[PDB]
């Protein structure tokens, strides 16, 4: 079959190396083959491949793969920080990327083509080096691969082998192996310890490879020099496997394939998917398709229906390298919104798979936990009522009345047992009576009653609706203050702790936000009331709240308007030069710009400016972050892409064209807002 020869000629010294961190969460791009066979996902940041996942979407194995160039005499620039990167996709209907990194000093230029092998688990990167000033022979090019197998940078075992006369740098941890190869091979290799004797450190001192270790374990960096005199353009392949032979064999198969063929196959698969989506009479734009592919690419390929929140590690630069994947979890709320985008786009199958995933969760838990791993196992144990309701609402829109016994009834019964109060509202920080959460509960029980009737369970149907009607009539008395310190004192507050929104009640804001009276805090989430058809867009209580919200937490950035989640939000960078580590300052959410746009449509007004604002908030790669700065409207180091925000953009974009709220459950609207 294959002839692999391993050798341990020289082991690295003075390990295990210093501790590491993940890459910046601001991504230039994300991708994966549009099939379930190729279980590899990649992300791009700062002009280079950042985290790479295998064999599941919540299993990061790589921190970075970047190029380092030097003249072998003095300067040593790291492309990820000493060069300007420009990103563009192969086409508007494929998650394939081209990167052009131009040295800030204009000495060199590196161009990359990145995508995966549709048939096997391998990441491909074609690259070419160009000498802008002087001659190419005056430069040295080195590749630095940083493996963080199974979500951790420490204790990574690195070594070198030879598969069919092909020198591959190997890395392993438990059952996960990686193989790094070159179509033209390496001019030299070395596996050293991070910040000790790694390729980067070796160059800072010698500006050329001095060490050539072929073994190491800990926080390692697998470096290699590219023989430029042999070819300024080459192909780098990274394969994965559950063994040395598998990884190596996979790399050999990918390398043996014709480049253009692999690339075209990758693009065609993605294009095929895009062309299956509604184009809205030719109005569908690039951001629409980009958003839909990103969502499509956010599903685990083993646990189908498991869509994650974001394929990034927020403020990763400041996060320690051990076990990280906060946004790599499944939230019923985010999944619900993502499913709505798939529905709006015409990909009903994807929405149903996500619903069936949730049905599986309810079967094993009897309810929806705060969030779960992609496997379906519960993670956090917070109690969010809105999360118990959304799957019911989705069951209704997908007309999946077959899930009544396994999904609808258990969740509806659970909600009636503990509602209308919630353990925590959608920001997952505080409990009480929330207009957004109660809106979800009313909509969910109404949809549950509808489905119960379809199943001829009239007893439950009546029970559910009666509860829904009762809670709907109490929303105002429980969350609408008329004694607030803001504006005219009349508005829905973020959340009430007691059964009287006019009473005094101190709450503790998360992330070091401080202590304030419930009446001092407003949250744009109240618009969920109208979004779900629980309240009319022209209800004077809604308008009154809007005045207070825009006077306190609205900001017109040079990219357009956006809003904070609520006053005194601390979930974000404390300053422009500091990363979020638990206590800082919450920034603007393009997600909320989209939600306001959706409300405007409900109010019978043009939402184009909100569509345009979201478009400008997206970066060069068409990726929308969770948060953006108030002064420039540019992305912070928050999670990106924020799948929920892309889903919101898709729904807003489409809704603004149809002139109606495409994801609002009609029976709820007809009963309360019509």
TrEMBL record:
- InterPro entries in the cross-refs: 6-hairpin_glycosidase_sf, 6hp_glycosidase-like_sf, Gal_mutarotase_sf_dom, GH-type_carb-bd, GH15-like, Glucoamylase_active_site, Glucoamylase_bac, Glucodextranase_N
Please identify the protein, giving its name as recorded. Glucoamylase
The protein's superkingdom reads Bacteria
Membrane-traversing stretches: none
- PANTHER family (alphabetical): GLUCAN 1,4-ALPHA-GLUCOSIDASE, TREHALASE
Instruction: Tell me its EC number(s), please.
Output: 3.2.1.3
UniProt xrefs under SUPFAM superfamilies: Galactose mutarotase-like, Six-hairpin glycosidases
Q: Does the keyword Ribonucleoprotein apply?
A: no
**Which family does the similarity line name?**
Belongs to the glycosyl hydrolase 15 family.
Q: Where is the Glucodextranase N-terminal domain?
A: 12-274
CDD domains for the chain? GH15_N
Domain GH15-like span(s) in chain numbering: 282-652
Q: Give, as one word, the top-level EC class.
A: hydrolase
Question: What GO biological process, any one, is recorded here?
Answer: carbohydrate metabolic process
Q: Which gene encodes it?
A: ga1
Which UniProt keywords are listed?
A: Glycosidase, Hydrolase, Signal
Q: Name one GO molecular function term.
A: glucan 1,4-alpha-glucosidase activity
Task: Give yes or no: UniProt keyword Transferase.
Answer: no
A Pfam entry, by short name: Glyco_hydro_15
């Amino acid at each position: 079959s294959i002839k692999i020869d391993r050798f341990n000629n020289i082991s690295a010294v003075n390990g295990p190396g210093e501790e590491d961190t993940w890459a910046s969460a601001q991504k230039q791009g994300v991708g994966t083959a549009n099939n379930y066979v190729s279980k590899v996902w990649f992300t791009l940041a700062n002009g280079a491949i950042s985290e790479v996942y295998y064999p599941t979407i919540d299993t990061a194995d790589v921190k970075e793969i970047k190029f380092i160039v030097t003249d072998g005499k003095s300067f040593v620039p790291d492309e990820t920080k000493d060069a300007i990167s420009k990103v563009e996709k192969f086409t508007d209907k494929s998650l394939g990327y081209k990167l052009v990194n131009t040295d800030k000093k204009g000495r060199y230029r590196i161009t990359k083509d990145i995508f995966t092998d549709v048939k096997r688990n391998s990441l491909i990167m074609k690259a070419k080096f160009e000498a802008l000033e002087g001659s190419i022979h005056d430069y040295k090019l080195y590749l630095a691969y940083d493996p963080h197998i199974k979500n951790q940078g420490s204790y990574n075992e690195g070594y070198v082998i030879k598969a069919n006369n092909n020198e591959m740098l190997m890395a392993k941890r438990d059952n996960v192996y990686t193989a790094l190869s070159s179509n033209i091979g390496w001019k030299g290799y070395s596996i050293g310890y991070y910040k000790v004797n790694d390729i980067m450190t070796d160059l800072d001192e010698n500006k050329q490879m001095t060490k050539h270790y072929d073994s190491a374990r800990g926080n390692i960096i697998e470096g290699a020099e590219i023989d430029l005199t042999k070819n300024s353009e080459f192909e780098i392949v990274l394969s994965f496997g559950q063994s040395d032979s598998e990884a190596a064999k996979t790399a050999l198969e990918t390398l043996g394939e014709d480049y253009n063929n692999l690339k075209n196959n990758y693009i065609d698969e993605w294009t095929k998917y895009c062309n299956t989506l509604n184009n809205f009479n030719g109005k569908a734009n690039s951001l629409y398709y980009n958003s839909m592919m990103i969502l499509k690419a956010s599903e685990d390929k083993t646990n189908k229906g498991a869509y994650i929140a974001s394929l990034s590690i927020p403020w990763g630069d400041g996060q320690r390298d051990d076990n990280t994947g906060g946004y790599h979890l499944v939230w019923s709320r985010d999944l619900y919104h993502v499913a709505n985008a798939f529905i709006a786009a015409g990909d009903v199958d994807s929405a149903n798979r996500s619903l069936d995933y949730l049905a599986k969760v309810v079967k094993d838990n009897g309810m929806i936990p705060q969030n779960t791993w992609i496997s379906g196992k519960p993670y956090w144990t917070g109690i969010q009522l809105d999360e118990q309701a959304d799957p019911i609402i989705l069951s209704y829109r997908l007309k999946r009345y077959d899930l009544y016994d396994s999904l609808v009834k258990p969740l509806a019964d659970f909600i009636i047992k503990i509602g209308p109060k919630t353990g925590q509202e959608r920001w997952e920080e505080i409990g009480g009576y929330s207009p957004a959460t109660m809106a979800a509960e009313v909509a969910g029980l109404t949809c549950a009653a509808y489905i119960a009737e379809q199943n001829k369970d009239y007893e439950s149907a009546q029970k559910y609706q009666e509860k829904a009607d009762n809670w709907q009539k109490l929303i105002d008395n429980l969350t609408y203050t008329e004694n607030g310190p803001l504006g005219n004192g009349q508005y829905y507050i973020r959340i009430a702790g007691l059964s009287d929104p006019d009473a005094d009640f101190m709450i503790n804001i998360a992330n070091g936000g401080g202590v304030y009276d419930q009446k001092e805090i407003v949250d744009p989430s109240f618009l969920e009331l109208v979004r779900l058809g629980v309240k009319s867009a022209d209800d004077p209580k809604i308008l009154n709240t809007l005045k207070v919200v825009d006077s306190t937490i609205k900001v017109d950035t040079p990219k357009g308007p956006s809003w904070y989640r609520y006053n005194h939000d601390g979930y974000g960078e404390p300053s422009k030069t500091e990363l979020y580590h638990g206590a800082g300052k919450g920034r603007l959410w393009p997600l909320l710009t989209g939600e306001r746009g959706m409300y405007e449509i409900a109010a019978g007004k043009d939402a184009t400016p909100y569509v345009k604002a979201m478009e400008k908030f997206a970066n060069e790669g068409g990726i929308i972050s969770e948060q953006v700065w108030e002064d420039t409207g540019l992305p912070t180091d928050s999670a990106s892409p924020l799948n929920w925000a892309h889903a919101e953009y898709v729904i807003l974009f489409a809704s603004n064209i149809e002139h109606k709220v495409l994801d609002m459950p009609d029976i709820v609207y007809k009963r309360y807002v019509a």
